[PDB]
Amino acid sequence: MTDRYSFSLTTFSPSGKLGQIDYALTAVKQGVTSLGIKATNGVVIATEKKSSSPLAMSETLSKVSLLTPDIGAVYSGMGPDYRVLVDKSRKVAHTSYKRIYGEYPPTKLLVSEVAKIMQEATQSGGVRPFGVSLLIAGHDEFNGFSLYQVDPSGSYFPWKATAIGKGSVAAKTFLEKRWNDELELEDAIHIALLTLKESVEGEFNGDTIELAIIGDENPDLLGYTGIPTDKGPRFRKLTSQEINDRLEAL
Amino acid sequence: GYDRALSIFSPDGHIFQVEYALEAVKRGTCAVGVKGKNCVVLGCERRSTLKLQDTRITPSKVSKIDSHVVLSFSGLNADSRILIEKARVEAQSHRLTLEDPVTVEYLTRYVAGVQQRYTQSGGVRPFGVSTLIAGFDPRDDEPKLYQTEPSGIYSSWSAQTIGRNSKTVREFLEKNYDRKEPPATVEECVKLTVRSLLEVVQTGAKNIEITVVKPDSDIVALSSEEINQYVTQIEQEKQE
Amino acid sequence: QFNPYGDNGGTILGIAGEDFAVLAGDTRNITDYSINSRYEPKVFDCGDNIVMSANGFAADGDALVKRFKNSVKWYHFDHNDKKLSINSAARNIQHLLYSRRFFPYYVYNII
Amino acid sequence: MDIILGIRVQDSVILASSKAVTRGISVLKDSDDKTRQLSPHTLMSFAGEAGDTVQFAEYIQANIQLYSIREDYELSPQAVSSFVRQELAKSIRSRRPYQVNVLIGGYDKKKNKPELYQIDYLGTKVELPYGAHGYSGFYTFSLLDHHYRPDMTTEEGLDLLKLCVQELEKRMPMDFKGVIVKIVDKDGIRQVDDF
Amino acid sequence: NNYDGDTVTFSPTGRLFQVEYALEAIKQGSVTVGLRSNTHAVLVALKRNADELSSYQKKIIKCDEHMGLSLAGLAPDARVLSNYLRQQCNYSSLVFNRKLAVERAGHLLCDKAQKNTQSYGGRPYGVGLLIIGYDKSGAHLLEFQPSGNVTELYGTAIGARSQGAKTYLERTLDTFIKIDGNPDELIKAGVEAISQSLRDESLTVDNLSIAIVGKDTPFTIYDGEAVAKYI
Amino acid sequence: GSRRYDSRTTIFSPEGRLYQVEYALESISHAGTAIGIMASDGIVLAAERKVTSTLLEQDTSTEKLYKLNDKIAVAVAGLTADAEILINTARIHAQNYLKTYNEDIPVEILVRRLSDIKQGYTQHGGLRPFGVSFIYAGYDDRYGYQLYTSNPSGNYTGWKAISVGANTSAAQTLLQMDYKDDMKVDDAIELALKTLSKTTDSSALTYDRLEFATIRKGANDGEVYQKIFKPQEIKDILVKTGIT
Amino acid sequence: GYDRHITIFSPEGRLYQVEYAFKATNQTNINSLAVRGKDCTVVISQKKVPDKLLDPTTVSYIFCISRTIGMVVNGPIPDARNAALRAKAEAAEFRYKYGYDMPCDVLAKRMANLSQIYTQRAYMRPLGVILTFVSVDEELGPSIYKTDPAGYYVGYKATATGPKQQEITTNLENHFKKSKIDHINEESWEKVVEFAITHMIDALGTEFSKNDLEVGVATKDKFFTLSAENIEERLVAIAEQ
Amino acid sequence: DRGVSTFSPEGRLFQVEYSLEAIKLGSTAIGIATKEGVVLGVEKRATSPLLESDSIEKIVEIDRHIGCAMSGLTADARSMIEHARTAAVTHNLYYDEDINVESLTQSVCDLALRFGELMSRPFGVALLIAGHDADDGYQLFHAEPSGTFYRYNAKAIGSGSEGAQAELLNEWHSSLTLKEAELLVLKILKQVMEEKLDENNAQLSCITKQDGFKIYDNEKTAELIKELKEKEAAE
Amino acid sequence: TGYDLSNSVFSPDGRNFQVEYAVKAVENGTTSIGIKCNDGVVFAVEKLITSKLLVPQKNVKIQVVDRHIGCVYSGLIPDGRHLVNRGREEAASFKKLYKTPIPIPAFADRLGQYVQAHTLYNSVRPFGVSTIFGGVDKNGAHLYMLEPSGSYWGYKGAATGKGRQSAKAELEKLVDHHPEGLSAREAVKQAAKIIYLAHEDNKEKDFELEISWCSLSETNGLHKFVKGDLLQEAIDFAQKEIN
Ligand SMILES: [Cl-]
Ligand SMILES: [Mg+2]
Ligand SMILES: [Mg+2]
Ligand SMILES: [Mg+2]
């Protein structure tokens, strides 16, 4: 046995293209649309719950995932690749930061660590690149609210608002017209729901849409009282009912 | 670990990777070595395609391995640094274990052995570098000049050149260098080294580097003006 | 605490003649004040006209002799059945003993 | 080994080191030079357990000489002393630590100042005008505390050193067979052949 | 064709071509004969030279006092496998004070050769071996192929033109098996057997190599003027 | 076995070139242009962001100019992800040197170390090289202000003025024309921006499409200051030089 | 065209080796079905013993992973047993390390992550199997979670796997469209098994004897398989109404 | 591509056969064994007149009683010589004696097939190992990259090998003196060499029981060349 | 195409062609069978006499694992020996830890997983053998057959090799005509017959019969070879049936 693939599977072609990264990006293009919008007092990330079967319980499959109490993530592309990246992202937030500094990492540095993992899959031996693009929204004390995109190459860019996947080109155009620097969180959620309706074919409701926010601290979700400085997580996943309420005022 | 055999024999009995490494040397800038009666001179070409260069900080072509030995090269620049570093480490290791500095022949044999090792080790390619190693052994006044190449063979030379258009300058040295009476002085040795490069270089401005090594760790690099005086005198005698 | 060494007693004697040599040893094996055997051979024919005896701790003595006999066997395989000279055997035995400098064979050897 | 002294004067560093090597009740040598030139303007004297001393000194020497060749540049005495300290601080938590104390005397050609560093086997570094290792300082520090000025000449430094040595020769029970003295200044390193 | 690049690849008909090519190296090798009775076992080998100035390549190797073999094919591979046998025979003696059974020696060679036919990177052994020996169950003769197959036989031959000697032994089966307590006559039958594989060249003094083992006979090799008796 | 699928990233062509290094350089030629100019009293680093969007958060963005330590910075041309792997290694190396010798690392030593790492990927390991070319801008007390470049081959050279990435041929000609030895930082700033403005593939050169930085002794007395320009500060220097 | 031999991307952003592993899933030509009751989870699978020389008791694609978790496999038996052994080892290790029984959905995720690795790492091939994990979880209640060669997994109200999965899937879809609930409203597991068999008969259009079926049942604190005689009793009750 | 340890359909290792082609391109080396000693001679073949020919080291000492000449990719021989010297020297440590020439040759040949995917390829050099021991007397061996070694009374390797071997076929007899062998090597070298044979482009050496292994001076060889010319002109 | 050049590669069918090519090597080998009886199992194998020079009864093909399991195989003989060596390691470690001798179903999976592992990587070749094995444990008699893919099932009767179709047909008759069961001594006789009947597919060269058995009553649940009079009795019965 032994892993005898100690050589790179991603290499430069004569034209300077890294084929496997381009092909990974093509897989992301086929994936279901997801988006992120940054407000003055929060960030929103959203996507469609494309259910493979009506017998399948789509609540058990979570496309939007908590990485830290103040950082969340959503994706477009290959679901299984996303799931393992979330597992690694959660762990690296502890091993390379929290166990050293006694606090959770800022958004940009966690993104940097995830980006590193994805870059290594682009150069290391006997592996293919991850077939996903991530949108990571988060908050931290000194940088405030932020939204980052991470691609299969490992490259990451900060965004005011963006979209990835199936209908990203149209969705990014839609966001350019609506976005401004004075948006409140509720306005951003409203714009997110409008933008997402254009890329969805079938049912459009709280059960087929997955949406989370990074906003105010939630002391009700902390699980304990007695420490004033601990005020609770800023990440919150909106319920099916909470989404439907905002679809009536749509 | 990556174990792939890159350097292998072909049906006609050739190791193409080693031969292709020689082509990389052929592409490299010209380097020349001439030994006189009481000195050795190392000449090197600098291609003038690169101007706006900072000549203070740009890696010099001739490298000191120890206080009494120098190494110049032709071929891949990055590859040469690895050989030079290894050579420098070995030179100190020799002083540390045997309480004597390396002989020029020993240092050459080490560098050549490293090059050979990279022609039959798994997962590695040969060095795209040929070197000229020159100096004087400790407590000795006999000049030493050796050459190495990617295959790992090495030998001693009265005078030798490597790199691009080395065929031409070797032709010049073969008819101009006399073994029975070599360059008796430093001037004569430097003059012959500059003359040989002027067959190939193009302009005699900042394209020629000269490094003189004398006995007892007396090594010095000539400046632009000092070399320019040789270039002037050569061409003025040529106009006749 | 476990003591890996022991003393099996015994005494050996080697005398060299002009064209011959003898290696003698008693056949008694003991621990403390008890007798283990009244006849336990201690001197061995190792091949190539060499006789050997490792006296002291019998377990180490048996191991050394066993290893030297093996060294003679492999000397024949590796060097075209060449006869192992007594001086070459002595040098080989030095290397067997010093291979355990830091956990010695507790024996005094004579060939 | 036994006694190593160091004193930084106006324009140089003076290092005095004993000549004796002893194995039990016998003096094996009475002309031992307990020092290595690390670079043309940096000298290191040393004392500790047999073997460790020379092995460490020559190991440091080789590393500094390697740096000099690679960069075609002499490291500052401060940079050298820091490198040495790190090697000793690394050594103290190793399987078998180097049992060596050192003095590093150097002339910084950039700042045009002499510098003396005292480093013990634990990796304890201190910059000083004068210093000693072992039982040496116990006898000499009172004289140095009294007589030392920072504007002293090299000749005045040597005279103060002779006084320190005279006190050692009187009150120390061990015969260390005199000292080899070396001066480190702008022009390099030289040995005082008569002391 | 497309399935002979390495040992790890079956062909569409279930063949291992690298093993078959290793088998081919044996057929190119010089002839060697093996045969036994109930009391003794004999090896006879035709040694090959490079030219008239050269020596004749040795074919027979001793493994223990009671066991040894003859080779046909790549000689260095025989040196590796014979060294392995020497160690195994020796492990049996040192640990168990027991002479290694010839049948068990065959099983060990089979298993060693097999590992080289199923793994990537390595190659099969390019040599055939004829192992003779005398153990607690009497005389034995084995034939080793680098495919891994080991076979116990009354007699056999391997190498170039080995079919002639093998036919002879197949006729003589009833005669030479009965040659008990007579080493010289058993060797004669072996020398006569290997002679059926000769063309142009004949058995000379430095050409022939013989080895024997038996009841009260340690494994010994005969070369030079020692085999002139049998020419 | 696995041999079948091995591209063999570390081999010579018949002509004596390294395939993957050459193809990596081809990749870098499509990257945004980065320019470095060295003056007597400082160094300028200018670089062009690639076809940006209006929704990109520029003030928190960094794709070209990175800080290695207080004295040394780099401009990137190529795969950003690859560059960050190397940048973090260089940052660690600078700190190792500072811990060992208690002095800031000389620029060339840091450059050599990174270049040696790049070289290793071309000679062994069977891995693809880093598709990155750096411009190093730095200062130390030995050589003063220094500009270097390194490329995927692991070869590095020193420069008075240099460009990497797209349109380097055109950019190097323009720099070679207008550069002089007695030049100052304020003049070098103007040269860098003018060169980008003429070589750019975009219709017009604006603040949102640029990253800019200077290393000046223009700090209070004998010391060096790094200035990574903010979006508003890039907008001001574009008006000052008369481009917008 | 070596992008079809190992798990790297094709120009279309596809992994052909993963897609071909999905096709190996149907090589056995067996259909499985899983449904949830109130207190239980039932899984049924077709049993085909073509050779008379086979010992029919040893022919099985249902596995008892732990006391609480059961697993049915759709695909070749070597890969099926490979997955079964690993899941058993993982379930046991989990209990040792974390002090409580491994949940069905957590095991499914773990096995799905292992499958994901085979789609990314070149030297490892995907297993040509679809794994359906069933239990009565102590927190989530009756549970069905299914894993595939792509590394995808999800929970189910009910599910079906095999060549004729679509016919079974639609049959189940139509039932839950009527009842408007996420399970079979039935007290005893015996009647939930009867429901499962009845709806497979209707969907496939074939009658079953006792030796044609294989049944696994998950209750609180134990998972077990039914014997041929237990299935016969089940078939008799179906025929009598 | 294909495995490094692959067998051809004929039952030969591709890489070993290809390394033999590299040895055919190498400079000529000849060995002749007699009862008075073994002579070793080589063609130096300098690529240029500026190359100091005395630095060309194709004849090498392994021990006092064993010498060695090489032909082919001579850089590959350095690690083989190093191993041989270590083996000879180590055996003296373990057994307080000289090592047999055959045993030394066997040790060198054990390295040969240690290649795969150990070193990445076979050696591209052949060796003529000459020496003397008490058991088998004066000996000459030819060590190939196949791991095979043949003993020879006389042997030529390199570019002019088959032509030289045919000449050695006729000239060698069991009663050859050392002086006769010296001239015979010079005669055959002069026949197969491209350039004209002299003391600077050819080198002689020998191994005797008394004096051990000795490389001949250029002055000593020059006299033997002059002695050769006169005896050929004598008839 | 090219899907059949490397092991562990799925074809567009979802097949591993390298494993299917390994089966061809099995089909090329000699015939071997297994018969499950009332309180045990019987194994038999066809040994082709390539030459008169082969020593009779010496080249033993059937192998024992532990003391209660018998193994026989058809195809590449060395591959079978490798598999049995592993089986012996597996049986030893089981007994070391758990004290009791390894049960047959447990043992069957140990081989199954090992063989299956050689279909997961291109760095290894699949096994070129189908292995028939079994014995007696605490739960009674068990017979198994294991293919190159790692696939195995329990059997009433099993057969593999060049004469497998002929053998299978004969085994099917015994299952039909003996629903209540077959005795151990009967199974030995029937085993001899079936190998003789299966020899029509290898009728060029003559052969040697080799039989073994494990039985609770006849061998105390231990694996033993059928020797001497009992072997000759089975040969006579077999020779009588073909004529
Ligand atoms: Cl996991
Ligand atoms: Mg990636
Ligand atoms: Mg201190
Ligand atoms: Mg894979």
UniProtKB/Swiss-Prot annotation, chain C:
Subcellular location, record wording: Cytoplasm; Nucleus
Signal peptide segment: none
Domain of life: Eukaryota
Known role: Non-catalytic component of the proteasome which degrades poly-ubiquitinated proteins in the cytoplasm and in the nucleus. It is essential for the regulated turnover of proteins and for the removal of misfolded proteins. The proteasome is a multicatalytic proteinase complex that is characterized by its ability to cleave peptides with Arg, Phe, Tyr, Leu, and Glu adjacent to the leaving group at neutral or slightly basic pH. It has an ATP-dependent proteolytic activity.
Family per similarity comment: Belongs to the peptidase T1B family.
Subunit structure: The 26S proteasome consists of a 20S proteasome core and two 19S regulatory subunits. The 20S proteasome core is composed of 28 subunits that are arranged in four stacked rings, resulting in a barrel-shaped structure. The two end rings are each formed by seven alpha subunits, and the two central rings are each formed by seven beta subunits. The catalytic chamber with the active sites is on the inside of the barrel.
Record's protein name: Proteasome subunit beta type-6
Species in which this protein is naturally found: Saccharomyces cerevisiae (strain ATCC 204508 / S288c) (Baker's yeast)
Location of this fragment in the whole protein: 20 to 115 of 241
Swiss-Prot record, chain E:
UniProt keyword annotations, A-Z: Cytoplasm, Isopeptide bond, Nucleus, Phosphoprotein, Proteasome, Ubl conjugation
Signal peptide: none
Keyword Secreted in annotation: no
Xref: SMART domains: Proteasome_A_N
InterPro entries xref list: Ntn_hydrolases_N, Proteasome_alpha, Proteasome_alpha-type, Proteasome_asu_N, Proteasome_sua/b
Positions of post-translational Phosphoserine modification: 11
GO cellular component entries: nucleus; proteasome complex; proteasome core complex, alpha-subunit complex; proteasome storage granule
Covalent cross-link Glycyl lysine isopeptide (Lys-Gly) (interchain with G-Cter in ubiquitin), where: 188
Biological process (GO), any one: proteasome-mediated ubiquitin-dependent protein catabolic process
Subcellular location: Cytoplasm; Nucleus
Superkingdom to which the source organism belongs: Eukaryota
Free-text function comment from the UniProt entry: The proteasome degrades poly-ubiquitinated proteins in the cytoplasm and in the nucleus. It is essential for the regulated turnover of proteins and for the removal of misfolded proteins. The proteasome is a multicatalytic proteinase complex that is characterized by its ability to cleave peptides with Arg, Phe, Tyr, Leu, and Glu adjacent to the leaving group at neutral or slightly basic pH. It has an ATP-dependent proteolytic activity.
Family: Belongs to the peptidase T1A family.
PANTHER family in UniProt: PROTEASOME SUBUNIT ALPHA/BETA
Further remarks about this protein from its record: Present with 7210 molecules/cell in log phase SD medium.
Protein name: Proteasome subunit alpha type-6
Originating gene: PRE5
Curated annotation (Swiss-Prot), chain G:
Annotated localization: Cytoplasm; Nucleus
Cross-link (Glycyl lysine isopeptide (Lys-Gly) (interchain with G-Cter in ubiquitin)): 222
Family statement: Belongs to the peptidase T1A family.
Keyword Ubl conjugation: yes
One GO CC annotation: proteasome complex
Protein purpose: The proteasome degrades poly-ubiquitinated proteins in the cytoplasm and in the nucleus. It is essential for the regulated turnover of proteins and for the removal of misfolded proteins. The proteasome is a multicatalytic proteinase complex that is characterized by its ability to cleave peptides with Arg, Phe, Tyr, Leu, and Glu adjacent to the leaving group at neutral or slightly basic pH. It has an ATP-dependent proteolytic activity.
Location, primary (coarse class): cytoplasm
Pfam family of the protein (one): Proteasome
An example Gene Ontology biological process: proteasome-mediated ubiquitin-dependent protein catabolic process
CDD domains, sorted: proteasome_alpha_type_6 (cd03754)
Key words of the record: Acetylation, Cytoplasm, Isopeptide bond, Nucleus, Phosphoprotein, Proteasome, Ubl conjugation
Keyword field contains S-adenosyl-L-methionine: no
Superkingdom: Eukaryota
This protein's name: Proteasome subunit alpha type-1
Residues annotated with Phosphoserine modification: 227
Note: Present with 15200 molecules/cell in log phase SD medium.
Curated annotation (Swiss-Prot), chain I:
Broad class of the protein's primary localization: cytoplasm
GO biological process: proteasomal ubiquitin-independent protein catabolic process; proteasome-mediated ubiquitin-dependent protein catabolic process
Cellular localization per UniProt: Cytoplasm; Nucleus
Superkingdom of the organism of origin: Eukaryota
A molecular function (GO) term: mRNA binding
Iron listed as a keyword: no
GO cellular component term of the entry, any: proteasome complex
Alphabetical UniProt keywords: Acetylation, Cytoplasm, Nucleus, Proteasome
PTM annotation: The alpha and beta forms are probably products of the same gene with different post-translational modifications.
Similarity remark: Belongs to the peptidase T1A family.
Subunit structure: The 26S proteasome consists of a 20S proteasome core and two 19S regulatory subunits. The 20S proteasome core is composed of 28 subunits that are arranged in four stacked rings, resulting in a barrel-shaped structure. The two end rings are each formed by seven alpha subunits, and the two central rings are each formed by seven beta subunits. The catalytic chamber with the active sites is on the inside of the barrel.
Remaining remarks: Present with 12000 molecules/cell in log phase SD medium.
Protein name listed in UniProt: Probable proteasome subunit alpha type-7
Species this protein is from: Saccharomyces cerevisiae (strain ATCC 204508 / S288c) (Baker's yeast)
Residues of the full protein shown: 6 to 248 of 288
